[PDB]
Design an enzyme around this catalytic site. Structure first.
Site, PDB file in Angstrom:
ATOM      1  N   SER A  80       0.824  -1.209   0.000  1.00  0.00           N
ATOM      2  CA  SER A  80       0.000   0.000   0.000  1.00  0.00           C
ATOM      3  C   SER A  80       0.860   1.262   0.000  1.00  0.00           C
ATOM      4  O   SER A  80       1.528   1.562  -0.989  1.00  0.00           O
ATOM      5  CB  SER A  80      -0.951  -0.002   1.201  1.00  0.00           C
ATOM      6  OG  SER A  80      -1.584   1.254   1.359  1.00  0.00           O
ATOM      7  N   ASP A 124      -8.157  -5.894  -5.859  1.00  0.00           N
ATOM      8  CA  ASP A 124      -7.938  -4.595  -5.230  1.00  0.00           C
ATOM      9  C   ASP A 124      -8.829  -3.536  -5.877  1.00  0.00           C
ATOM     10  O   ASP A 124      -8.709  -3.263  -7.071  1.00  0.00           O
ATOM     11  CB  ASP A 124      -6.463  -4.197  -5.337  1.00  0.00           C
ATOM     12  CG  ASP A 124      -6.065  -3.127  -4.337  1.00  0.00           C
ATOM     13  OD1 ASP A 124      -6.905  -2.262  -4.008  1.00  0.00           O
ATOM     14  OD2 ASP A 124      -4.902  -3.152  -3.881  1.00  0.00           O
ATOM     15  N   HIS A 135      -7.645  -5.434  -1.415  1.00  0.00           N
ATOM     16  CA  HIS A 135      -6.565  -4.667  -0.801  1.00  0.00           C
ATOM     17  C   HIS A 135      -6.221  -5.141   0.610  1.00  0.00           C
ATOM     18  O   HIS A 135      -5.047  -5.244   0.964  1.00  0.00           O
ATOM     19  CB  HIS A 135      -6.920  -3.178  -0.765  1.00  0.00           C
ATOM     20  CG  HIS A 135      -5.802  -2.304  -0.290  1.00  0.00           C
ATOM     21  ND1 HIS A 135      -4.786  -1.879  -1.119  1.00  0.00           N
ATOM     22  CD2 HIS A 135      -5.533  -1.782   0.930  1.00  0.00           C
ATOM     23  CE1 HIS A 135      -3.941  -1.131  -0.431  1.00  0.00           C
ATOM     24  NE2 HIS A 135      -4.372  -1.057   0.815  1.00  0.00           N
TER      25      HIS A 135
END
Lengths: 349, 349
Positions: A142, A296, A325
């Site tokens: 991330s 994601d 995610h």
């Protein structure tokens, strides 16, 4: 300076804190006493060439990495490499709005820190405390992937391998919008008091609201439709929020979240090349494995694949995970196996 | 009873209002004087066989349909068919929390209306005011598609053709979660006052927050990344919110939104068959064209395609639109052409 049991070694695991001194931020602000929190595993070899850096992600620390990704039976093997994870500035463990001794930058007076500021700070810490000038590999998820991109673009000759997982090098307009909604519901809480609250428990409602926002975007439609949360030992869909996600976010510091959220919103490695992203990623010398998560929602494969096509000598290794995610939390059975397989191949070349 | 210039004929276009009398809701509640708002275009033929029903969607009325979808140069041709659009219960134009004369169900005392309640009400209106017992076709978007599914399942022999656009027959758990976040940020506004506000302008902050939530989920990542909003004549990304989306939602009634949101959250045509969705959609006799939008984030093709595989004699016609779910507003150049092509083919068979 506030007290939150969440941001302690007893919860996040053992870690050390060193100061790198005065740090002048890009946005203009200055952190006089800039100290970072880091955790290590493994032994640095004679010529200091087996070091692997792991930047933390949003609302996170080093804890997840040391309890999910790192081990002798994993690619990130502390038997082979010196694995060090440095916490983001203002992430709650490093120098942050709600733990700084400096009154000029305390709480709502805490300056705006960019991803670039973190990488500059991290390089200083690595040199100061270990004398590390080159990294075997840089792995992050991330926002950690954002810092990974910043590392291989800003200091091209200091990184040999890169593994940006579920993250982009230049923040897309949709990511900005989504992140804005996260900040709004927190600032919407009257207990937040414009960043001058006395306890994170006062902004409990706002934190819980953000938690639900993550449940909507941080997973995938199939994750909920197939009830993939059952393997986590949770009873119902509502239990996933009330007994897992909600307690997690409600334990965090609003100012810390808002700070890292801003940092996230302005991730842009093309700043080094006047906006030309193609030219920026062209600087990349490190062997890079762009690894997005298949489902994601706000860091989709197409976005990551677009960037991967600009990084010379790189490869695209999509991680198949229904959890999207938040699959970074290792909530799927086949997640870590995929991560280890790709990282091992990366570490071989 | 409140005053909102948004919910008037001057804004939504011309429409009539008739009462169908006492309506007993499934959830237990009762609307003593249940009156609906409807708009028509075209002439009903001798044997009343050219009628097309168009249910409204969330936060919407009939206005969009009559100014984007309906015309002589379109499939929904008022030269051929009697096209009638009936507004949802509590949608702001029909009998609603903030316009009902009944004090027992006024504002926060307004009962819970299900999709099934709307279809029952609509059938009563169609018979009472026009003597229509069979529909040439039923076309709806989003929640209108939900009502479309409910129509062809509850009254199978009363519908010849169906066109559920960007919507499911049974609400998935992810849709529930997303819709919950919409309701929370509105209820988070102190001006909301537990549903007993004096003006929608008092809940301005909550409405604006929901607007941003729609910007995050109601479009697509590519919509923002390619700046597809430029063809709408908007200057910047921020202008899309501040000058279009935000003014739109801030003009609406919170109680009305919360009511339709609940209705949305409990859409389930499998209620007729004890939960067996396959058995429910098996009842479908009407020629159905399931038409999801390609980039629809919370009504994805896979979800709609799954349902389409249960509807006998149906076809799947995916609408290609980068704007995702909010493509229903006809913000893309090739949107309506696709809609008209498919609907014409449907109307031919």
């Amino acid at each position: 300076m506030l007290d939150n049991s969440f941001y302690t070694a007893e919860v996040q695991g053992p870690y050390e804190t060193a100061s790198i001194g005065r740090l002048e931020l890009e946005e203009g602000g200055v952190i006089e006493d800039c100290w970072l929190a880091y955790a290590t595993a493994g032994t640095l070899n004679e010529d200091k060439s087996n070091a692997i850096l792991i930047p933390t992600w949003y609302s996170g620390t080093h804890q997840t990495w040391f309890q999910q990704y790192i081990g002798t039976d994993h690619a990130l093997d502390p038997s082979k490499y010196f694995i060090i994870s440095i916490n983001q500035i203002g992430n709650g463990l490093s120098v942050s709005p709600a733990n700084t001794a400096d009154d000029s930058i305390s709480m709502s007076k805490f300056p705006n820190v960019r991803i670039g500021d973190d990488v500059v700070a991290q390089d200083r810490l690595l040199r100061q405390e270990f004398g590390i000038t080159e990294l075997f590999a840089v792995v992050g998820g991330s926002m950690g992937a954002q810092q990974t991109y910043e590392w291989i673009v800003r200091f091209p000759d200091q990184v040999h391998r890169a593994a940006p997982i579920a993250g982009t090098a230049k923040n897309t307009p949709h990511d900005f919008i989504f992140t804005q909604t996260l900040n709004e519901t927190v600032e919407a809480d009257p207990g937040f008091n414009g960043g001058e609250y006395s306890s994170h428990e006062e902004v409990a409602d706002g934190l819980r609201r953000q938690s639900h926002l993550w449940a909507a975007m941080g997973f995938s439609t199939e994750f909920w439709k197939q009830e993939a949360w059952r393997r986590l030992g949770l009873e119902s869909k509502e239990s996933v929020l009330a007994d897992f996600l909600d307690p997690l976010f409600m334990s965090m510091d609003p100012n810390t979240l808002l700070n890292n959220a801003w940092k996230w919103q302005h991730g842009d490695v093309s700043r080094h090349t006047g906006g030309d992203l193609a030219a920026a990623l062209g600087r990349v010398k490190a062997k890079t494995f762009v690894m997005p998560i298949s489902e994601d929602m706000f860091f989709p494969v197409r976005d990551c694949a677009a960037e991967q096509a600009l990084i010379p000598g790189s490869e695209l290794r999509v991680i198949e995970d229904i959890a999207g995610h938040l699959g970074l939390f290792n909530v799927s059975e086949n997640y870590i196996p995929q991560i280890d397989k790709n990282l091992k191949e990366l570490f071989e070349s």
